[PDB]
């Protein structure tokens, strides 16, 4: 038996961050509050097909591996300097690819300049997924 149909699903993941200079720096002494997030556009659900999101913070951070298993996939923190932040997105999925890794640029602005509101769109294609993962991907 064989199939007469091919199916190709495209998903959009939004990753982004906000970064605000603190009024007073902490004892440590961090100068900014910032938050980094993974979400679907226009408040769409991605838990149907995302197993967990892994935020690899910089070494200088306590407990540098942060793991979110359920929405919101976000981390909130304070700091003094920007850095590359590899984000791993694991899928509710049988075969390759099981996860994918981005290098997210977590940058901060200086005092007297607006806060940071950065939004980045990444688009992935799953060519002929298994039927179960296709259902997870297009779930209402």
């Amino acid at each position: 038996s064989h199939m007469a149909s091919s199916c190709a699903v495209q998903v959009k993941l939004e990753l982004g961050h906000r970064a605000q200079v603190r009024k007073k720096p902490t004892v440590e002494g961090f100068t900014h509050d910032w938050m980094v997030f993974v979400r679907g556009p226009e408040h769409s659900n991605i838990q149907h097909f995302v197993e967990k999101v892994v935020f690899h913070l910089h070494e200088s951070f306590p407990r540098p591996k942060r793991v979110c298993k359920d929405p919101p996939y976000k981390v909130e923190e304070s700091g003094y300097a920007g850095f590359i932040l590899p984000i791993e997105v694991y899928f509710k999925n049988k075969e390759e690819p099981r996860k994918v890794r981005f290098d997210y640029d977590l940058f901060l602005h200086l005092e007297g300049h607006p806060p940071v509101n950065h939004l980045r769109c990444e688009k992935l294609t799953f060519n002929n997924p298994t039927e179960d993962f296709r259902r997870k991907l297009l779930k209402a």
Binding site: H58, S60, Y80, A81, G82, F83, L108
Partner: peptide, 8 residues
């Protein structure tokens, strides 16, 4: 120029 210093 609009950005802070960075880490390692």
């Amino acid at each position: 120029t609009k950005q802070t210093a960075r880490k390692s």
